[PDB]
Design a protein around this ligand. Structure first.
Ligand SMILES: NS(=O)(=O)c1c(F)c(F)c(S(=O)(=O)CCO)c(NC2CCCCCCC2)c1F
Ligand SMILES: [Zn+2]
Length: 258
């Protein structure tokens, strides 16, 4: 009876195994654009992905991860609100059963069709497993997806999904360039938060880009053909693998713009 996204094991149940679910800096949150404060002391985000080494893509039974070699400074995030250098380890998405839902963060209560998370860890802590135990251990760059024109840089991901349909399947995924998933503007909101999945650790500096990327209806439909179940089990479509917005509590969301 492990955690997941269903009626019986979804986000409203998580607190029973992971009490930090009702903590003081949980994610995601609603971004109220009117009350976010412009902070002119925030710096531009530095996204240095030119040397990224993708390795593999994995269906983990909740979503899929695209994994990177993080054993050297190859793909790093710095600047913005961050001190020091954060190394890209993986990215993944959350998405809906319908185009009107799927994102974890919301913007003035607006849900997007999906949300991309590029997960990076603070190199001062040496490994990811050490970084997640620290209040400034992770930086996750979140990017909203809306349905419209196709995103050409997403298509290599969509095309490999049929090879990892079920839980525990993986496939080689080299030479993928995550720059193709970025929107044009790096304007962002930022706040202190958590992993949005168990173990819900409060170790994340969230950086959420204001500008969504557009993906096509055919692209997101392919996401919705994945399966939460393993091979040779009844089909449970992998959809609605998002956690709702959590109370902001004693936090301020800062804007890098306007
Ligand atoms: N949504 S998130 O960006 O807070 C996040 C992380 F930051 C994170 F570090 C990870 S992790 O896999 O690197 C360490 C915790 O497992 C996941 N993991 C999920 C990735 C796919 C989303 C659905 C749940 C399965 C693990 C993860 F979801
Ligand atoms: Zn995520």
């Amino acid at each position: 009876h492990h955690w997941g996204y269903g009626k019986h094991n979804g986000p409203e149940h998580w607190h029973k195994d992971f009490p930090i679910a009702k903590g003081e800096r949980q994610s995601p949150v609603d971004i109220d654009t009117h009350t976010a404060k412009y902070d002119p002391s925030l710096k531009p985000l530095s996204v240095s992905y030119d040397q990224a080494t993708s390795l593999r893509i994995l269906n983990n039974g909740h979503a899929f991860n695209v994994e990177f070699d993080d054993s050297q400074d190859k793909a790093v995030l710095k600047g913005g609100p961050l001190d020091g250098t954060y190394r890209l380890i993986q990215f993944h998405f959350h998405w809906g059963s319908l185009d009107g839902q799927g994102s974890e963060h919301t913007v003035d209560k607006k849900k997007y069709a999906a949300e991309l998370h590029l997960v990076h860890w603070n190199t001062k802590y040496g490994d990811f497993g050490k970084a997640v135990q620290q209040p400034d251990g992770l930086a996750v760059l979140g990017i909203f997806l809306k349905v419209g024109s196709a995103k050409p840089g997403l298509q290599k991901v969509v095309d490999v999904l049929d090879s990892i349909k079920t839980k525990g399947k993986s496939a080689d995924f080299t030479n993928f360039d995550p720059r193709g998933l970025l929107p044009e503007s790096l304007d962002y909101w930022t706040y202190p938060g958590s992993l949005t999945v168990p173990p819900l650790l409060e170790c994340v500096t969230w950086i959420v880009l204001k500008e969504p990327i557009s993906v096509s209806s055919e692209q997101v439909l392919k996401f919705r053909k994945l399966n939460f179940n393993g091979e040779g089990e009844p089909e449970e479509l992998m959809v609605d693998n998002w956690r709702p917005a959590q109370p902001l509590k004693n936090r301020q969301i800062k804007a890098s713009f306007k």
